[PDB]
Curated annotation (Swiss-Prot):
Gene Ontology cellular component terms for the protein in this record: cytoplasm; endoplasmic reticulum; extracellular space
GO biological process, one term: defense response to Gram-positive bacterium
Name under which the protein is recorded: Lysozyme C
Originating gene: LYZ
Compartments (UniProt record): Secreted
Entry-linked InterPro entries: Glyco_hydro_22, Glyco_hydro_22_CS, Glyco_hydro_22_lys, Lysozyme-like_dom_sf
Gene Ontology molecular-function annotations: beta-N-acetylglucosaminidase activity; identical protein binding; lysozyme activity
Source organism of this protein record: Gallus gallus (Chicken)
Family per similarity comment: Belongs to the glycosyl hydrolase 22 family.
Residue positions of the active site: E35, D52
């Protein structure tokens, strides 16, 4: 599923991501924009052989099981395929664990490079929320 900008903002809010660990909804929408272009089916292979999955490009190295990332963990207790669903519940639940891990949204390198310190409220501007 390719979400609309305001459609995804509403789904993230419904699942309690808005101001989760102090990150406003615009921060989450901005991170999804640059990670996946709002596409739940987005995948990207890392040089290390791990894979990133879903709207928030969650990595098999630590967070999900894909059976092809030697030495990896599954700290969200999910198959990585759950992160590609039209329903964002698994991505949101796992992102809450990631952003609680100590480095906040710096875990998402695209958030650090493209979202951090920018006018992230622009990402929810005009949305009925
Ligand atoms: Na894994």
């Amino acid at each position: 599923k390719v979400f609309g900008r305001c459609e995804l903002a509403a789904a993230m809010k419904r699942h309690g991501l808005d101001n989760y660990r102090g990150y406003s909804l615009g921060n989450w929408v901005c991170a999804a924009k640059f990670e996946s272009n709002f596409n739940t089916q987005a995948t990207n292979r890392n040089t290390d052989g791990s894979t990133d999955y879903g709207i928030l490009q969650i990595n098999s190295r630590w967070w999900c099981n894909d059976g092809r990332t030697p030495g990896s963990r599954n700290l969200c207790n999910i198959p990585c395929s759950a992160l590609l669903s039209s329903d964002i519940t698994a991505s949101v639940n796992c992102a809450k664990k990631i952003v609680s891990d100590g480095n906040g949204m710096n875990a998402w390198v695209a958030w650090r490079n493209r979202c951090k310190g920018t006018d992230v409220q622009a990402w929810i501007r005009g949305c009925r929320l």
